[PDB]
Amino acid sequence: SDKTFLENNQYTDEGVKVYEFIFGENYISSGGLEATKKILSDIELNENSKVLDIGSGLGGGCMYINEKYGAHTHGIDICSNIVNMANERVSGNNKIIFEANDILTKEFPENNFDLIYSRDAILHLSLENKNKLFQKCYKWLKPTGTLLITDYCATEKENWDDEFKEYVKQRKYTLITVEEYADILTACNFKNVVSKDLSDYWNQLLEVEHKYLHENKEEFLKLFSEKKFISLDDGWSRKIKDSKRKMQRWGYFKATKN
Ligand SMILES: C[N+](C)(C)CCOP(=O)(O)O
């Protein structure tokens, strides 16, 4: 299954902990806390709002949203191990729920959520399944609700080089252009579709993370090995190179139901 592939490779327990080291406590998404603050800076919610986080990871996004707004947050992630980790990070809070499930089969009521949020998770879905997911999101959103996404994107496939092809293949990502992604949202009937190519800002975030890794190498080596350091260091180096030249891109999408 896809679930097994993710839990046994990219998101093993150790893989997740290595990601958390560089992204920041409670995060496996780009830019950790600081990007979260920026991405939510123009979003309005309150204690009565209902939020779905698709690909909730270690839960930092939901923790932040609930802290900032007091909103009810429900995170779904297909990886059972990651959800177990997230659930160890929150207690005594009846407004934060993390659930291990496949978002493509999960049932939610129509007109349910004030915000559907997702951070660097939909890259795992095939193109067919991205379309299916966004159709479900449209239904699940309240008439007044907002969809807010960041995700890994890319230049057109014809332009990819050998190293980038191999990264995408090994990860089993489906990376499309920012423009194709926006077109899916438009085809699902979302309104006010705003897409931003945030590759430059992503490059900045990556540089901050890369510098952190380098400055904290000693501590990393005590927690994990030199082999894992090299892999992580080289992975960030390629992302920095490829975002600078817009081969690998970072897309931001915001849209509404009405
Ligand atoms: C995709 N993610 C942001 C959840 C984890 C990191 O993936 P990657 O940048 O190592 O490909």
XYZ file of C-alpha atoms and ligand atoms in Angstrom:
269
model
C 0.000 0.000 0.000
C 0.909 3.683 -0.135
C 0.642 3.788 3.628
C 3.237 1.048 4.010
C 5.564 2.701 1.482
C 5.501 5.963 3.433
C 5.873 4.438 6.891
C 8.714 2.186 5.846
C 10.811 4.655 3.887
C 10.486 8.420 3.955
C 8.529 8.536 7.189
C 10.038 5.804 9.379
C 10.201 6.962 12.987
C 13.825 7.934 12.552
C 13.154 9.665 9.237
C 10.498 11.775 10.939
C 12.826 12.659 13.847
C 15.572 13.704 11.406
C 13.072 15.939 9.584
C 11.907 17.401 12.880
C 15.497 18.253 13.802
C 15.852 20.515 10.794
C 12.303 21.847 10.335
C 11.731 22.442 14.016
C 9.890 20.995 16.949
C 6.572 19.451 15.931
C 7.133 20.036 12.240
C 7.937 18.062 9.116
C 6.706 20.857 6.796
C 8.827 23.537 5.100
C 9.859 26.439 7.295
C 8.400 24.924 10.512
C 6.952 27.482 12.893
C 8.075 30.617 11.159
C 6.513 29.713 7.785
C 3.329 28.709 9.617
C 3.105 32.154 11.176
C 3.549 33.806 7.805
C 1.145 31.547 5.911
C -1.604 32.129 8.504
C -0.956 35.844 8.891
C -3.991 36.926 6.894
C -6.300 34.152 8.021
C -9.185 34.865 10.399
C -10.736 32.170 12.622
C -12.054 31.935 16.148
C -13.009 29.577 18.932
C -16.021 28.399 16.963
C -14.117 27.605 13.767
C -13.549 24.068 12.492
C -10.280 23.299 10.744
C -9.114 20.249 8.834
C -5.346 19.739 8.350
C -4.587 17.308 5.536
C -1.246 15.665 6.207
C -0.961 16.907 9.770
C 2.416 15.297 10.434
C 3.841 15.965 13.935
C 0.941 18.316 14.657
C 2.682 21.659 14.983
C 0.312 23.276 12.468
C -2.797 22.249 14.402
C -1.151 23.255 17.699
C -0.422 26.681 16.276
C -3.873 27.163 14.815
C -5.528 26.142 18.057
C -3.205 28.388 20.061
C -3.658 31.420 17.850
C -7.399 31.208 17.261
C -8.818 28.682 19.758
C -10.267 26.802 16.768
C -11.239 23.145 16.687
C -8.509 21.369 14.675
C -8.692 17.885 13.150
C -5.536 16.518 11.523
C -5.514 13.497 9.250
C -2.319 11.710 8.252
C -2.021 8.320 6.617
C 1.042 7.317 8.618
C 0.055 5.670 11.897
C 3.441 6.145 13.429
C 3.465 9.875 12.788
C -0.010 10.235 14.270
C 1.159 8.346 17.352
C 4.012 10.804 17.671
C 1.737 13.773 17.270
C -0.655 12.438 19.920
C 2.286 12.260 22.392
C 2.773 15.983 21.914
C -0.663 17.156 23.046
C -2.719 16.331 26.109
C -5.774 17.664 27.813
C -6.936 19.539 24.697
C -10.344 18.514 23.425
C -10.080 20.834 20.477
C -7.093 19.066 18.832
C -7.610 15.653 17.267
C -5.086 13.678 15.226
C -6.398 10.692 13.241
C -4.558 8.099 11.156
C -6.567 7.587 7.998
C -6.548 7.873 4.203
C -8.030 11.251 3.338
C -9.195 9.766 0.011
C -11.630 7.434 1.828
C -12.364 9.425 5.000
C -15.942 10.635 5.312
C -16.726 14.165 6.451
C -20.053 16.014 6.175
C -20.671 18.524 3.397
C -20.317 22.149 4.485
C -18.289 21.246 7.520
C -15.012 23.212 7.725
C -14.145 26.864 7.972
C -10.586 26.138 6.848
C -9.017 23.216 5.014
C -5.265 23.518 5.415
C -2.453 21.422 3.998
C 1.295 21.892 4.126
C 3.593 20.005 1.741
C 1.575 16.794 1.777
C -0.441 16.554 -1.442
C 2.781 15.915 -3.471
C 2.368 12.263 -2.422
C -0.888 11.925 -4.366
C -1.132 10.895 -8.010
C -2.652 13.509 -10.345
C -5.924 11.583 -10.429
C -6.015 11.596 -6.642
C -5.139 15.282 -6.331
C -8.248 16.008 -8.422
C -10.354 13.639 -6.357
C -9.086 15.230 -3.118
C -9.814 18.777 -4.157
C -13.340 17.787 -5.202
C -13.843 16.371 -1.737
C -12.397 19.511 -0.189
C -14.870 21.646 -2.114
C -17.744 19.629 -0.667
C -16.355 19.585 2.868
C -15.840 23.341 3.012
C -18.526 25.586 4.434
C -19.998 28.102 1.994
C -17.915 30.737 3.787
C -14.793 28.536 4.091
C -11.247 28.838 2.769
C -8.803 26.321 1.252
C -5.170 27.061 2.038
C -2.340 24.966 0.677
C 1.390 24.888 0.209
C 2.905 22.094 -1.811
C 5.964 21.035 -3.707
C 5.682 21.886 -7.409
C 8.039 21.868 -10.340
C 8.839 23.245 -13.768
C 7.456 21.333 -16.651
C 8.676 17.717 -16.760
C 10.437 18.252 -20.129
C 12.881 20.544 -18.300
C 13.889 18.194 -15.457
C 17.475 17.039 -15.183
C 18.768 13.631 -14.272
C 19.196 14.334 -10.516
C 15.776 15.910 -10.178
C 14.093 13.064 -12.063
C 15.726 10.567 -9.741
C 14.625 12.541 -6.605
C 11.031 12.620 -7.771
C 11.113 8.936 -8.713
C 12.671 7.794 -5.460
C 10.189 9.825 -3.423
C 7.298 8.685 -5.594
C 6.050 12.299 -5.781
C 3.790 13.655 -8.431
C 5.002 17.206 -8.911
C 3.063 19.457 -11.243
C 3.467 23.113 -12.123
C 2.023 25.878 -10.002
C -0.190 26.753 -12.978
C -1.538 23.213 -13.425
C -2.291 23.081 -9.708
C -4.269 26.323 -9.829
C -6.194 24.978 -12.808
C -7.285 21.959 -10.765
C -8.713 24.225 -8.113
C -10.508 26.278 -10.756
C -11.901 23.107 -12.343
C -13.256 22.042 -8.913
C -15.182 25.356 -8.820
C -13.225 27.081 -6.148
C -13.523 30.875 -6.303
C -10.940 33.624 -5.843
C -8.154 31.181 -6.603
C -4.855 32.844 -5.711
C -1.661 30.995 -6.552
C 1.826 32.269 -5.685
C 5.118 30.794 -6.835
C 6.931 31.137 -3.481
C 10.108 29.476 -4.653
C 12.255 32.444 -3.561
C 10.802 32.461 -0.062
C 11.141 28.664 0.065
C 14.830 29.121 -0.875
C 15.172 31.508 2.068
C 13.552 29.007 4.406
C 15.841 26.266 3.136
C 18.898 28.428 3.720
C 17.895 29.093 7.308
C 17.402 25.367 7.862
C 20.675 24.455 6.132
C 22.587 26.933 8.297
C 20.931 25.524 11.395
C 21.950 22.005 10.388
C 25.546 23.059 9.857
C 25.742 24.989 13.148
C 24.242 22.108 15.060
C 26.145 19.292 13.430
C 27.643 18.008 16.688
C 24.268 17.571 18.298
C 22.869 15.937 15.116
C 25.690 13.391 15.079
C 24.982 12.493 18.702
C 21.337 11.870 17.892
C 21.729 10.272 14.488
C 24.678 9.296 12.362
C 27.109 10.880 9.978
C 25.480 8.971 7.099
C 22.120 10.571 7.905
C 23.726 13.974 8.208
C 25.301 13.723 4.746
C 22.027 12.616 3.196
C 20.133 15.484 4.840
C 22.836 18.064 4.025
C 22.978 17.008 0.372
C 19.181 16.904 0.137
C 18.896 20.501 1.325
C 21.755 21.565 -0.953
C 19.878 20.226 -3.998
C 16.621 21.871 -2.935
C 18.414 25.185 -2.557
C 20.022 24.843 -6.005
C 16.830 23.694 -7.682
C 14.588 26.319 -6.106
C 17.021 29.070 -7.092
C 16.638 28.056 -10.723
C 12.943 27.240 -10.430
C 13.338 23.587 -11.322
C 11.740 22.620 -7.996
C 9.143 25.151 -7.000
C 7.050 25.906 -3.935
C 3.423 26.723 -4.539
C 0.992 28.556 -2.308
C -2.736 28.351 -3.056
C -5.675 30.053 -1.391
C -9.289 29.768 -2.567
C -12.851 29.963 -1.375
C -16.016 28.021 -1.830
C -18.028 31.131 -2.730
C 7.542 16.594 2.080
N 7.785 16.973 3.414
C 8.030 18.473 3.415
C 6.657 16.534 4.222
C 9.010 16.296 3.947
C 10.350 16.620 3.270
O 10.505 16.062 1.971
P 11.823 16.285 1.144
O 12.039 17.779 1.073
O 12.950 15.575 1.847
O 11.545 15.698 -0.235
